[PDB]
Amino acid sequence: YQRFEQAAAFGVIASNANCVWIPAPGQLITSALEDVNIWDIKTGDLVSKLSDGLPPGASDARGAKPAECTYLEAHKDTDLLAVGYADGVIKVWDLMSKTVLLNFNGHKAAITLLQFDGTGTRLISGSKDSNIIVWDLVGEVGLYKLRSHKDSITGFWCQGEDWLISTSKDGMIKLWDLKTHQCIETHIAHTGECWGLAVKDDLLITTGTDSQVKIWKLDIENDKMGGKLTEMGIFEKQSKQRGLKIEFITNSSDKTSFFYIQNADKTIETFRIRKEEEIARGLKKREKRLKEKGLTEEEIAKSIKESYSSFILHPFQTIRSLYKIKSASWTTVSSSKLELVLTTSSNTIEYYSIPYEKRDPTSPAPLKTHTIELQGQRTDVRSIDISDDNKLLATASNGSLKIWNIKTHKCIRTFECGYALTCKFLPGGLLVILGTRNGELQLFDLASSSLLDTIEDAHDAAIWSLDLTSDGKRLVTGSADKTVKFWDFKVLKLHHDTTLELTDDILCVRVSPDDRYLAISLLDNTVKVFFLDSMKFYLSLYGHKLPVLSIDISFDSKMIITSSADKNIKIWGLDFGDCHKSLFAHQDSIMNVKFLPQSHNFFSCSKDAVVKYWDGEKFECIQKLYAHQSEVWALAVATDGGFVVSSSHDHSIRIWEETSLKAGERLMEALDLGIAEIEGLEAYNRDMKNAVLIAVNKTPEQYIMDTLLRIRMSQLEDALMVMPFSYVLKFLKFIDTVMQNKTLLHSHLPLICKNLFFIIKFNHKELVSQKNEELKLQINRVKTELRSALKSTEDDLGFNVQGLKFVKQQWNLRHNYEFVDEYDQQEKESNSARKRVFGTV
């Protein structure tokens, strides 16, 4: 067999990520699923498309859907783009070379935000897995992990190498000391989810779930054990929805600062920061207004605090966009005007400009200067078709019909149509015919670029499907009104010929290639096959548990496939209505199935974002295609069979073209290393009057002590037994040194005792025979403080036991009844005394 690969993928202008504006209005960088698009805002044409490689469907390509870009960040000075993907992988890209430079992998979920340091050598990444990691570009490594957060990182601020502020979806704002890798302060920003963070000098603003917005001062050098961040005051934005992003920009000439609170809805609310003189000016007048109103000074003082927020921030303007906004960025700041760029969820970019003078803007609403909408389509493409010439691809959606060029990948024409559901080319490729949901049928001509005819009452309900005879002179239309209607082409206008009424709703209608059969799907899960010429009922296929969504008939009019929402593809021998085999193809409803022309091989597409290449005669999946990120709604196959076109819910059109040591022994090495150093320092100190240890960062006393701990007790007595005598003197010299450090001695007193006394008992005879005076003194020293260290603990135990008896004795006095008769005292004590039951044999 021959392999299908993704030749090209287009129709996407902006996916679900942030947009980066780069000066030359300049260009824009936007996310297109697994690829990044560089546009020219002035012209509306693509500049360059960044594709890592490994085209989907190739053998070396992974058998999983590609990881989509989630965040973009570019360092203008160095011309680097670092791209975050939904798999947690950061790829540093060279804009000039348009190639991957570095590939960081340290996250387990989607990357949410990314931010270069000022110098552009260090990269900070926050991911949905709640971790902030700081990466080194020159070092190509992950330096340290900040893990205090308990949910996806919504925002963080780090402009100076000393300090880092972070937010998260769990409602915490946290401070981070970059030099310590630890969390210093913690405040609950908002009652629910804390989404936004923006910082200018001390001023800090964050957004919760509601319209409440908080103001904080950042006294970085406060250093009081608290209050480095304090709540200042709250103000309410107009929109009731959450605020995702906030960004500042300062006008150099007038030193004016502005910021916007990007909501979840179609509203962007801009703001101004008042100057210090303006605040004092405003304060003095307001005091007079309240003083004129006759309030007390104390109330006035409180009110100015209660009205604190009003003095700094001025609601400047609100941008209202037709389509839900996804992300935004300031573009240029000047005295004359303010410019913004944003992206929507409807696959478009919008450039908004705001002319303003002094306090308030000149216009009631912003001026929309540029828009990029030609090369993409707002609503999902519900049905597609390929012209017989295999040159023109028609894509029909709610509210619009566009026509594409397959070689060049550049749209030619656009038509405004109803809620499209099914579209097909008329023979010759000069006209297109469309099925609207409201029951209307539309006919368009490419050359005129205008709609020719409309049949408003073609059906009372949605025209779910539509098909043409091979001759192209008859049209079959299937609708939810439980009817099928045949239309003829007469010079061009459509004449209704006849109606066929059915018992149930109609979902698909397919006329066989030789124009002898008519297959009709229904909502009762039954496919009915008719004779086209005579309309005589022929067969009734049965066996889909859910309604059949698509049907197709082999080129030789022998095999007919049925694909249903019950996740099954059933291949039926048309001669007798026998089903050869039922395939459990996709994990979710299978939407469209098409035969490759001149063969029994066919393609299948479902909601699972997977397109599968099947083999008609052996009934096996030849290949699995994972390229789309979401539902694949429609599918088409070229008449030649050279390529297959799939369009999905992600607004993307894709073209598929055909091509060790044991206990005892470890202790000896520990003794040699530790005591070699201890003797080394002692000799060094006496005259004045290693790599392993520094790597673990432990003093020689500890290093050996830890190794003793690691030895399991069941091996400890045997481990010491193996030891030659020459190491015992080393071991005794160890305990001597441990005695000076009183902390270690009492931390591990019981262990030191058991090993020490066991060493002495085992090789007592050789120990005493030695005449070394220095050994005698060490046993003198090691003896004395061992008694004191033991006696010290023993003294504590003795004092407590006697006192606790006294306390027990004294309570037993006040509150315990006493019987003069001893027999009565016996019974009372037995009842009072604790009882425990034990199993007995």
Binding site: T180, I184, C753, N780, K783, V801
Partner: protein, 233 residues
């Protein structure tokens, strides 16, 4: 879900919720969207013939047949206000609690752990604070901090001392804390604290065992003497 006949039904919270009174004497608050019982209010012991509402049900008044009036008031936002404030305080204490250890301010960190009741962190405070002591009991500041402990905090601490005592690897931390308590608190008062005795009664038998041990460690240490006297010969 009503055990007996329902005699009143009223909408509250606009469409969201419904309240119903039954002969059982139980007032049940239902969720219209889900049809599930969010809350049950029980302030009567007989059938309820009257149920009046105000402010979308922010004030509810229900009558028992015997003649008992319950004047219910909505307090959801108030309870939410309380927990938010309590939560805001809790975060501050914890963040401070971690911060003190990194500096090592044991005298303060003991208080925060005692209030927050983190049995691990309290233990590490005493242990590494005790380590510094080796180089009256713990140190002057922290010993004072123990002395100020009230009746509730002593019981909680003595519970922690009891458990730590049972383990032979951590008893040394327990005994010194108990010693600090007897030396800086009125023994008369400790006896009268309810339940301290049952806590105390458990401490003694484990303490005696630890005394029998250690003593043998002193005893069995005299091998070093016998080693020395041999060497002198």
């Amino acid at each position: 879900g009503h055990t007996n006949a329902v005699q009143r039904c009223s909408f509250i919270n606009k469409q969201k919720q419904l309240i119903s009174c039954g002969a059982d004497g139980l007032i049940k608050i239902w969720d219209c969207s889900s049809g599930e019982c969010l809350k049950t209010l029980d302030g009567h012991n007989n059938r309820l013939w009257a149920l009046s509402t105000m402010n979308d049900g922010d004030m509810i008044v229900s009558a028992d047949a015997d003649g008992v009036f319950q004047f219910w008031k909505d307090c959801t936002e108030q309870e939410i206000e309380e927990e938010q404030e309590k939560a805001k305080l809790q975060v501050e204490q914890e963040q401070s609690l971690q911060n003190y250890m990194s500096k090592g301010d044991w005298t303060n960190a003991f208080l925060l752990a005692m209030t927050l009741d983190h049995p691990m962190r309290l233990f590490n405070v005493l242990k590494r604070a005790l380590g510094e002591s080796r180089s009256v009991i713990f140190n002057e500041e922290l010993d004072q901090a123990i002395s100020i402990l009230n009746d509730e905090q002593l019981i909680l601490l003595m519970k922690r001392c009891r458990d730590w005592n049972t383990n032979a690897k951590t008893h040394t931390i327990a005994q010194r804390t108990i010693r600090c308590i007897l030396m800086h608190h009125n023994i008369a008062k400790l006896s009268e604290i309810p339940g301290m005795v049952k806590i105390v009664d458990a401490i003694i038998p484990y303490t005696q065992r630890h005394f029998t041990r250690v003593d043998n460690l002193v005893e069995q240490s005299y091998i070093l003497d016998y080693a020395l006297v041999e060497m002198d010969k």
